[PDB]
Design a protein around this ligand. Structure first.
Ligand SMILES: CCCCCCCCCCCCCCCCCC(=O)OC[C@H](COP(=O)([O-])OCC(O)COP(=O)([O-])OC[C@@H](COC(=O)CCCCCCCCCCCCCCCCC)OC(=O)CCCCCCCCCCCCCCCCC)OC(=O)CCCCCCCCCCCCCCCCC
Ligand SMILES: CCCCCCCCCCCCCCCCCC(=O)OC[C@H](COP(=O)([O-])OCC(O)COP(=O)([O-])OC[C@@H](COC(=O)CCCCCCCCCCCCCCCCC)OC(=O)CCCCCCCCCCCCCCCCC)OC(=O)CCCCCCCCCCCCCCCCC
Ligand SMILES: CC(C)=CCC/C(C)=C/CC/C(C)=C/CC/C(C)=C/CC/C(C)=C/CC/C(C)=C/CC/C(C)=C/CC/C(C)=C/CC/C(C)=C/CC1=C(C)C(=O)c2ccccc2C1=O
Ligand SMILES: CCCCCCCCCCCCCCCC(=O)O[C@H](COC(=O)CCCCCCC[C@@H](C)CCCCCCCCC)COP(=O)(O)O[C@H]1[C@H](O)[C@H](O)[C@H](O)[C@@H](O)[C@@H]1O
Ligand code: HEM
Ligand code: HEM
Ligand code: HEM
Ligand code: HEM
Ligand SMILES: CCCCCCCCCCCCCCCC(=O)OC[C@H](C)OC(=O)CCCCCCCC[C@@H](C)CCCCCCCC
Ligand SMILES: CCc1nc2ccc(Cl)cn2c1C(=O)NCc1ccc(N2CCC(c3ccc(OC(F)(F)F)cc3)CC2)cc1
Ligand SMILES: CCc1nc2ccc(Cl)cn2c1C(=O)NCc1ccc(N2CCC(c3ccc(OC(F)(F)F)cc3)CC2)cc1
Lengths: 535, 535
């Protein structure tokens, strides 16, 4: 008797505890159903996978630089001195069943975590979800993104590897040593000595499995709590206002689709972990200060750092008996970058002056200046990222390495300007397309007028029609407009039988007029709610 | 202008957010001011300290069994092969400023965590705090205690050491490989091979810095959430009923005193970490399977297990080609212990039949059977714990080791019975003391009656007095009774000047009158609240 058991357990829970009010309150919470709002979920989902994979990896990884001979299965590295960390990474790849798969999906999940964070940040930036109600969210999210990047760096740096080892040498050692006042001191504190210090990998392990994931989890808890209680923002629409959330309640619909999206994201990550090779460390011998590779890139989320190193023209300064290495520059760069990312909503509200409680999102086209700024930032990020890959780009695409370096050098100043101009004009053009469709209506096939040979596109008004042919123009309300009759109720009733065979005409009828009635009732209900809001 | 700044920040928070209702509700929550209710806080506080210390130790500890010669500062262990984990523990003790202090306070905080969990469990059990609402909090609390014991085990087992190494060898290896069906399989999965397997310490590190701490943190969060939202239970008293909480609000008083208690507990822990030496691993040579010492004990929270093994009469069984080693027994016994701990409240409500929603605690004396059971359990635990020390007890207190073993063996059945009988009769005698105080009143000095030589105690009634001398007997109400005229308004007006010099008689008179009136106002408020509640 499962129904009776469920009732009894509910009564026990509500008799010991009293969550009925609270449980109902969240089960009834409405979440907007825009696809873009799922972007952030991806990151969360990816994050979860990382945790689930990370713990597994912790059961088989020994962080240390204790030199050891492999003496393991992988023949091409036998008797070769390697840190215990590299030996255990090799053991996970080869010695433990599924270990290659587990660490592969872990690294793919790290990459997806980074990429989905970037996509979510772009979404919220261009849609203006960071305004008055939710700057703090932005801020923590920015911090969150930063942490992710660094943890990723500490992730592929954990298995002491030639690629990851040279990445540590460049970034941590060189840049930290370059910092003027305390740079050498910070370097000696982080490594407990010079670069090959014997307490680096254990410290990175502690930072990467315990500290940074814990901080990220706390910040994600804060993020999701704010989004939950600062109820999600929404795009402008028919019944959508600054004082309501139009969508689907949590329990019936939103929870099911969120869980299904987590399942499908996990499936994508598993398929990648199987079919795609990520960080094949065995090909990468154990780290040695002398051995090198030509590629020598970090994961894509630090490629912008590496490209900024490459493109910055070797500018150093030499004070009284002191050196300020060019590496210093990148540190300042990151500062500014982060200092501008974390603080952006406050600069936006200081310049624009928008200090109002904004709950309705803004289409990126409706904010040409911010859309242009974000496109410029994305262009600079892409330029830096590809500059980090200028070695490989030159190798595969035959372009001289100096030519690629100088293309990046001139680009980091020119390409942002061109992209800003183009994005500004593009946003204004999208606005004008919206205005044109409002004032004329959707476009269709051409007809030749009866008496003469006039050719007219035979538009479709979206609103009331004037006494004559042309309609009354509608007022833009910040919502997307249909540029294709395709997406209206035109030519959209295929036979509902099957792909191969039909269903009886009575069944097809029943179904099609039922769907027509349902969608008309949806439209009518939204319109009636809209009118009831004001009227 | 700190007032203006605070007002502006509050307005900004309440404009971006709307927590005024929630903030007020959590600021007004009432928590009873009984000392025993702070006991659990100790554990939480100590837990926090562990985290704060644990992180510090993760920046300096290298888990591994990579054999290395010390070649460090500690001369007595130089050129001796040992694990990198032991080398880094020694470096923390000697090579890191304050590292010895930090790890000593970490171990002392682990011991205080265990002891305070154990005392808090004693409080909850004897007071019936687990009885209906809060039965789950007992289960989740009992699972915190088990996790804490295992966490401490993996902690002092973490720095590969002679004492901790032999502890691992005994418990984790022998008991695990003694289990009939899967003992060897579990042993090989845990160690990745035979006992000294090269993956043990890194896996224990993963379990001890992240996994088990994470589970404990989540369970503690659930525990505190339940206590917070299942309003904390209270002892019976004047204005206290099943349907209220009498005490102090959170912010002005409870929060300040809780913070001060956290400060005082961390001060005690720091004082212990400095003045008291805990786990001098440098004296404990690096673990070698052929080496062992006489002591060979685990931390107190696990000693009972060892004690059990010492006192269990070497009973084995030999099925067809197989053997169940006597070690198995302790595991089974351990199971039983936890099996009887996690599932106690349900056994209590099955035997007594008492499933009512109890928000008022009950004094241990008021429940003689449960008090006797708890005393019996504590007696068995103490017997086992001291049996685990029978080596040291025999050494210092000259008793033949065989005599101590057999004393423990006979005791683990006799002493619980004697303690049960004594505690039952003691609880009933305490009840009778309370009943006679109610019937007759408090006791005082003796007087010889005027006409004859009668000597009378000169009692002092607590309630209405009958027409003649003797008072109407009061009915027990589940609250402590005053057994000393000490603790009433008797002989309690010392000089308020100072310890050395007086204050002017006017100031003393004003102060004492004000305190006297304040006590009347408090008692009167409680009395009117009582009368309004009942009538
Ligand atoms: C970690 C990462 C994983 C994801 C975790 C984050 C998820 C966040 C989603 C938020 C959902 C949420 O909070 O749900 C709780 C939420 C509590 O909020 P509420 O009840 O609406 O209260 C009214 C508002 O709080 C009244 O507030 P308001 O809306 O008027 O404005 C105040 C608001 C202002 O908004 C904020 O500032 C929120 C942001 C807070 C920042 C930091 C929060 C978390 C940071 C810690 C990091 C975590 C790690 O502050 C809050 O409400 C914060 C509440 C704290 C919870 C934070 C959740 C995390 O819902 C419930 O109570 C549901 C639970 C029902 C009880 C259990 C049912 C059965 C009981 C049996 C128990 C055991 C059975 C054994 C047998
Ligand atoms: C970790 C280590 C240490 C452990 C720490 C745990 C401490 C727990 C104490 C609980 C206190 C608590 O949750 O307070 C939240 C509490 C929410 O509850 P409420 O206000 O009574 O709302 C109505 C009830 O929730 C409606 O519920 P009800 O009272 O009618 O009964 C339902 C109840 C049923 O009771 C339960 O079953 C509770 C136990 C749930 C089991 C698992 C909970 C957590 C387990 C995960 C482990 C976490 C680690 O369910 C709950 O309320 C659960 C709430 C979830 C929060 C759990 C806290 C953890 O109050 C607040 O939200 C006050 C804080 C306001 C935040 C905003 C203030 C300023 C806004 C700006 C922020 C950022 C500024 C940036 C610029
Ligand atoms: C700092 C900086 C960016 C300097 C300049 C370097 C740079 C990016 C130069 C451009 C590279 C190109 C496009 C070379 C083709 C020749 C060329 C320049 C033609 C004129 C360009 C032009 C405007 C043409 C008009 C039409 C048009 C837009 C054509 C673009 C053609 C292309 C390549 C489109 C796709 C863009 C693309 C995927 C570029 C490569 C990006 C990267 C980093 C790929 C990395 C990558 C590599 C390197 C692998 O080897 C590989 C092997 C197996 C599986 C996967 C991969 C993989 O993903
Ligand atoms: C998203 C990325 C978009 C690109 C952004 C940046 C746009 C700004 C472009 C700036 C162009 C600057 C070109 C100058 C560069 C420079 O200064 O270097 C020269 C080499 O000139 C060249 O090649 C001309 C190259 C010009 C091509 C730029 C074309 C634009 C492409 C990249 C756009 C496609 C983007 C597609 C992106 C895909 C989508 C992204 C998501 C000489 O080098 P070198 O080789 O050493 O020659 C030695 C002598 O020196 C020496 O004397 C002589 O003696 C010899 O020894 C000789 O060897
Ligand atoms: C670990 C990284 C992150 C996680 C797990 C995460 C998760 C989420 C989720 C699930 C949402 C709600 C769904 C949505 O609106 O898409 C959200 C909203 C938001 N995120 Fe993040 N995000 C992350 C990174 C960032 C970054 C880099 C920024 C900048 C940011 C700022 C915001 C803001 C301002 C919102 C509010 C949007 C709204 O109210 O609709 N987050 N985040
Ligand atoms: C939270 C975001 C996280 C990110 C972005 C991240 C990223 C990464 C990446 C990219 C690697 C490289 C793996 C390889 O190349 O083989 C790695 C390694 C590793 N990660 Fe993380 N990780 C995260 C969380 C965690 C957590 C929570 C744990 C532990 C519970 C963990 C444990 C490990 C371990 C042990 C390794 C080394 C094992 C190996 O390389 O095979 N990670 N991490
Ligand atoms: C890490 C371990 C533990 C922590 C941090 C902890 C913490 C706390 C705190 C602070 C309280 C409220 C203060 C008090 O009532 O004394 C509490 C209450 C409680 N504890 Fe625990 N405790 C732990 C272990 C246990 C154990 C071993 C049991 C058994 C248990 C059962 C309970 C119950 C039933 C309550 C509610 C009592 C009441 O409402 O007064 N807990 N715990
Ligand atoms: C949650 C309850 C915890 C308990 C009961 C506990 C207990 C212990 C104990 C008794 C030791 C022995 C240390 C010694 O004798 O020198 C230890 C070692 C250690 N603990 Fe924990 N611990 C806890 C949590 C943590 C946490 C949260 C971390 C990290 C954030 C941590 C990190 C460490 C490290 C790295 C060591 C080895 C360092 C050394 O011994 O030199 N512990 N633990
Ligand atoms: C990373 C932060 C970079 C901060 C640099 C702080 C430089 C202080 C030491 C400069 C110095 O005296 O060294 C001698 C120098 C090498 O030779 C010369 O005197 C001729 C210099 C001609 C060009 C100067 C252009 C300076 C621009 C910077 C002030 C802008 C920084 C932003
Ligand atoms: C260098 C580029 C690169 N080339 C290669 C080649 C091959 C491979 Cl495989 C990888 N790469 C990479 C690479 O991956 N780079 C990632 C990276 C870069 C810098 C930092 N930095 C943290 C802060 C430090 C800092 C700054 C300010 C401080 O002051 C404060 F904050 F106030 F305390 C303190 C510390 C500088 C180093 C991290 C990761
Ligand atoms: C042995 C005594 C001792 N002598 C010395 C001498 C010197 C020193 Cl320094 C310390 N000692 C100690 C010592 O500290 N003992 C602590 C101890 C005891 C047992 C276990 N066991 C948990 C369950 C495992 C188990 C069993 C069944 C399971 O089945 C399930 F639950 F269903 F999955 C799962 C796990 C076996 C090990 C741990 C620590």
């Amino acid at each position: 008797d499962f129904a009776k058991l469920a009732a009894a357990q509910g009564d026990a829970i509500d008799s010991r505890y009293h969550p009925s009010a609270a449980v109902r309150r969240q089960l009834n919470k409405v979440f907007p159903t825009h696809w873009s709002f799922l972007l952030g979920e991806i990151a969360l989902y990816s994050f979860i996978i990382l945790l689930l994979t990370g713990v597994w990896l912790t059961l088989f990884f020994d962080p240390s630089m204790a030199h050891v001979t492999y003496d393991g299965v992988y023949q091409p590295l036998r008797g070769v001195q390697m840190s215990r960390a590299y030996e255990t990474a090799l053991d996970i790849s080869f010695e433990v069943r599924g270990g290659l798969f587990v660490r592969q999906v872990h690294h793919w999940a790290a990459l997806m975590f980074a990429a989905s964070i970037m996509v979510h940040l772009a979404r919220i930036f261009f849609t203006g979800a960071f305004r008055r109600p939710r700057e703090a969210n932005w801020v923590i999210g920015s911090l969150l993104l930063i942490l992710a990047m660094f943890e990723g760096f500490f992730g592929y740096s954990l298995p002491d590897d030639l690629l990851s080892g040279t990445g540590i040498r460049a970034a941590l050692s060189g840049i930290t040593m370059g910092i003027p006042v305390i740079g050498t001191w910070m370097h000696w504190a982080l490594f407990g000595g010079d670069f090959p210090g014997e307490i680096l990998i254990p410290r990175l392990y502690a930072l990467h499995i315990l500290l940074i994931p814990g901080i990220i989890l706390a910040l994600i808890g804060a993020h999701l709590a704010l989004v939950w209680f600062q109820k999600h923002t929404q795009f402008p629409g028919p019944g959508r206002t600054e004082t309501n959330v139009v969508g689907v309640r949590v329990m019936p619909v939103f929870a099911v689709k969120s869980g299904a999206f987590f399942a499908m994201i996990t499936g994508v990550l598993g398929l990648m972990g199987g079919l795609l090779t990520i960080n094949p460390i065995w090909n990468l011998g154990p780290y040695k200060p002398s051995q090198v590779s030509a590629g020598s890139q970090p994961d894509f989320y630090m490629m912008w750092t590496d490209g900024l190193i490459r493109l910055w023209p070797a500018w150093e300064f030499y004070p009284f008996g002191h050196t300020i290495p060019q590496g210093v520059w990148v540190a300042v760069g990151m500062g500014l970058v982060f200092a501008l990312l974390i603080a952006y909503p406050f600069i936006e509200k200081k310049v624009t002056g928008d200090d109002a409680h904004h709950n309705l999102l803004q289409r990126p086209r409706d904010v040409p200046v911010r859309t242009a700024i974000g496109s410029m930032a994305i262009a600079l990020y892409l330029l830096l990222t590809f500059a980090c890959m200028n070695d490989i780009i030159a190798l595969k695409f035959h372009i001289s390495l100096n030519a690629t370096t100088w293309i990046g050098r001139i680009g980091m100043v020119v390409l942002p300007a061109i992209v800003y101009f183009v994005a500004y004009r593009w946003a204004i053009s999208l606005q004008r397309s919206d205005r044109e469709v409002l004032e004329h209506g959707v476009e269709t096939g051409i007809i030749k007028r009866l008496p003469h040979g006039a050719y007219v596109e035979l538009h479709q008004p979206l609103g009331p029609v004037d006494e004559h042919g042309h309609p009354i123009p509608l007022e833009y309300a910040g919502a997307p407009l249909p540029k294709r009759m395709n997406k209206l109720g035109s030519g959209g009733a295929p036979g509902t039988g099957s792909f191969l065979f039909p269903d009886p005409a009575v069944e097809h009828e029943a179904l099609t007029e039922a769907a027509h009635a349902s969608e008309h009732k949806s439209l009518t209900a939204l319109k009636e709610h809209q009118d009831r809001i004001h009227g």
